[PDB]
Each structure stands twice: as C-alpha cells, then as structure tokens.
Amino acid sequence: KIEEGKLVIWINGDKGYNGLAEVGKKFEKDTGIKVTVEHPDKLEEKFPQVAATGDGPDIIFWAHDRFGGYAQSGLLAEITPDKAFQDKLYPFTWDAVRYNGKLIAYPIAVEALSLIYNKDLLPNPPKTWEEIPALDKELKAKGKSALMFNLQEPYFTWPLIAADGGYAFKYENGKYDIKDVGVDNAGAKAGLTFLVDLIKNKHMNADTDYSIAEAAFNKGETAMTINGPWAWSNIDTSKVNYGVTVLPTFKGQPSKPFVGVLSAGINAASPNKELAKEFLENYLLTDEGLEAVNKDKPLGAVALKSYEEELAKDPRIAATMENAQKGEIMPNIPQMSAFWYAVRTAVINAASGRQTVDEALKDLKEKRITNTEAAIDTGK
Numbered sequence: 001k002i003e004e005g006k007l008v009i010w011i012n013g014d015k016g017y018n019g020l021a022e023v024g025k026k027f028e029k030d031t032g033i034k035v036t037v038e039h040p041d042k043l044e045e046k047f048p049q050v051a052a053t054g055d056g057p058d059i060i061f062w063a064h065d066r067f068g069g070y071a072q073s074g075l076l077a078e079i080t081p082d083k084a085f086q087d088k089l090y091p092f093t094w095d096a097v098r099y100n101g102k103l104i105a106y107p108i109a110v111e112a113l114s115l116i117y118n119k120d121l122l123p124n125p126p127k128t129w130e131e132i133p134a135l136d137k138e139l140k141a142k143g144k145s146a147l148m149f150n151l152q153e154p155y156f157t158w159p160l161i162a163a164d165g166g167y168a169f170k171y172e173n174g175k176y177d178i179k180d181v182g183v184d185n186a187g188a189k190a191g192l193t194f195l196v197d198l199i200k201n202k203h204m205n206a207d208t209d210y211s212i213a214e215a216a217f218n219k220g221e222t223a224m225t226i227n228g229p230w231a232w233s234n235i236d237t238s239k240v241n242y243g244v245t246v247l248p249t250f251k252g253q254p255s256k257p258f259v260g261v262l263s264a265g266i267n268a269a270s271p272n273k274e275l276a277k278e279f280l281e282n283y284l285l286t287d288e289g290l291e292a293v294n295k296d297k298p299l300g301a302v303a304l305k306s307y308e309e310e311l312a313k314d315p316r317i318a319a320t321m322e323n324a325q326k327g328e329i330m331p332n333i334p335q336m337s338a339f340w341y342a343v344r345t346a347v348i349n350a351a352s353g354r355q356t357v358d359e360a361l362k363d364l365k366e367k368r369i370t371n372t373e374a375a376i377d378t379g380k
C-alpha cells in the first residue's frame with residue numbers, strides 16, 4: 001500500500017528528475033511532506049500492473065498518449081482544477097490529456113523531435129532525406145557518419161514513415177477509428193523502404209539504440225542525430241558545437257513527428273490526492289518549479305503560458321515547435337499501447353532483414369495489431 005503523508009513520483013530517466021527533486025525539497029520545506037522522485041526502468045509498462053496491485057507511485061509522469069489507457073483501467077484519479085488555473089496553461093495542451101470528455105492529468109510541457117546537427121563539420125545541413133546517403137560517403141572518408149538515431153523505438157522513425165501520409169488511426173472530426181489503420185499505405189511503406197535502404201547500403205546500423213546514438217553525436221563521431229529537447233543538456237556539457245533545425249523532407253513532403261505532452265497523472269489508489277494536487281498546481285506548474293526541472297534537462301515548450309513566453313526566445317524551442325506544427329499530436333486512446341508495441345516489432349524486423357518491408361507492415365496491419373490488442377485485454 002502507498003504511504004499516507006508522503007509523495008512518490010515516477011518519471012523516465014531521460015527527463016530532469018534531479019530538478020524535480022529540488023521542487024520536491026522546496027515542497028518538503030513548506031509542507032513537511034517528504035517527496036521521493038524515482039525513475040525506474042520501463043515505468044510505462046511497470047505502472048499499470050503495479051497500480052492494479054499493490055499500488056506504486058502517487059504521481060506518474062509520461063507523455064499523454066498512454067494516459068487514456070490508464071484512465072480506462074480506472075488507475076488515474078480524476079483531477080479538478082478550476083478555470084482560473086486552466087487559463088494559466090495553453091488550451092491545446094489541455095485538449096491533449098482530455099479523455100472521454102474529462103480531464104485525467106496535469107500537462108507539463110510539449111515535446112517534438114528535431115534534427116540535431118554538428119555545425120563544425122556540417123555547417124550546411126541537408127534539407128532532404130534523399131541527400132543523406134551521398135553525404136554519408138563524404139563523411140565516411142573522413143572517418144565519421146552522417147546520421148545516427150534510435151531505431152529500436154518507433155517514435156524516432158515515425159517522422160519519416162508519416163511524411164508521405166502514413167498515420168496510426170484515421171480521425172473523422174474529434175474522433176479516431178481503430179478499424180482504419182494507415183501503417184500499410186503507399187506513404188508508410190515508402191518511408192520505411194527508404195530507411196531500410198539506408199541500412200542495406202551501410203549508411204546506418206540496425207542495432208543503433210538511444211545510448212549508442214547519443215554517444216556517437218556527443219563524442220563528435222556523427223554529423224547528425226534525431227532527438228528531443230531532453231537530450232540538449234548532455235550536448236551542452238559535451239562542448240559539441242550544434243544547432244537544432246527542421247527535420248529532413250521526403251519526396252518534398254516534411255517529416256511528421258508524433259508530438260507528445262509530458263503530463264503528470266495522480267494515482268487513484270493514492271491517499272495523498274490533495275497533496276498531489278497541491279504539489280503540481282502550486283509548486284511544479286509555476287515559473288519557479290519549471291525552471292528547476294528545465295535547468296536540469298530541458299522540457300521544450302512548456303504548458304504554463306507565463307514561463308513559455310520566456311523560453312520562446314530560445315531558437316532551439318522555435319525549431320521544436322516548427323517540427324510540431326508540421327507533425328501532429330498523438331492520440332490518447334487506450335489502443336496506443338498495443339499500437340506502439342506492434343509497430344516497434346515491425347520496424348525492428350524490417351531493419352534486421354527478418355521480414356521485408358511489405359511483409360512486416362502487412363503483418364502489422366492485418367495480424368499483429370489485433371493480436372496485441374487481445375494480449376493486453378486478457379492477462380499476459
């Protein structure tokens with residue numbers, strides 16, 4: 001059971017959890033309540049099974065896409081901020097994190113992937129994916145690579161896949177249709193085919209993960225990488241001279257990155273619901289609170305209007321918001337969990353040569369997605 005008179009927060013390791021501890025200590029200073037920030041492995045998978053026990057954290061921090069699934073399972077406490085508080089944050093930020101015509105979590109900040117490039121050895125970055133192969137050959141002669149990024153997570157390869165009209169679930173107007181899937185259309189296949197072509201011709205390695213790709217760019221071994229605002233902190237200290245720019249276009253069409261919204265939800269089992277609300281509204285979601293977190297590891301464009309006006313001057317955040325405009329907001333429906341688990345396998349198998357592109361994306365749409373939806377509905 002969860003301890004009453006205490007707050008336990010979970011947040012992913014790539015975020016600024018040490019900054020969240022500072023606001024935690026300032027909270028303990030004022031209220032006498034010990035805040036314990038944690039960042040366990042696979043917390044998005046760990047939360048639901050533990051929340052249904054047994055119970056885990058009081059607050060859970062993750063992008064909005066998974067929260068609608070949590071809310072369906074009755075895991076999240078219903079929040080009630082008044083309109084005075086809602087006006088402090090951006091309206092479209094509240095729209096993401098709204099499920100079933102109801103608010104389920106406090107949104108913190110919005111985040112979208114951008115092309116991060118080393119401007120000392122690549123002063124003129126490529127505007128197209130199509131230019132990268134030839135650029136890689138020029139750099140390989142110098143003993144370096146053109147592009148490296150996490151291929152093990154489909155969040156990073158989605159931008160290219162969606163560039164020519166690849167989508168997850170087709171909307172109508174303020175709705176989504178789970179029967180209508182866009183992961184096996186001309187645009188999705190073309191996007192993935194070009195990516196696997198980069199692998200086939202040794203311009204990028206299929207086993208490249210987050211850690212390896214980050215190491216490569218920050219050590220100065222690759223010219224470009226694709227990542228969000230959270231990664232900027234480590235590049236600053238690495239002293240690599242870099243810039244943040246619009247993602248490469250494919251067939252003249254801009255890449256469409258799935259835009260996320262870091263949001264904090266209160267556990268339904270938590271006996272510290274008031275303290276949770278007290279912490280988030282009055283300590284975290286303030287200029288002072290977001291500074292602490294943002295200084296540790298950047299959040300990107302934040303939901304709080306007052307503080308966002310300050311950050312908007314920074315050209316990195318303009319480039320993040322430019323990539324978000326071209327991209328589109330993630331759905332927050334419960335099926336996004338099964339979607340992500342299914343697409344992940346499909347992309348990996350295609351990149352490893354286990355399946356061909358057409359085989360993987362056909363299997364994804366036809367069989368894999370539905371099997372995954374059945375897996376989580378029953379016990380697994």
Ligand SMILES: OC[C@H]1O[C@H](O[C@H]2[C@H](O)[C@@H](O)[C@@H](O)O[C@@H]2CO)[C@H](O)[C@@H](O)[C@@H]1O
Pocket residue numbers: 012014044063064065066111153154155156260340
């Ligand atoms: O790769 C699938 C994964 O994508 C998103 O996860 C992002 C997240 O939005 C970022 O905040 C950061 O943590 O990087 C992650 C990529 O590993 C979805 O939020 C997530 O549900 C999904 O499984």
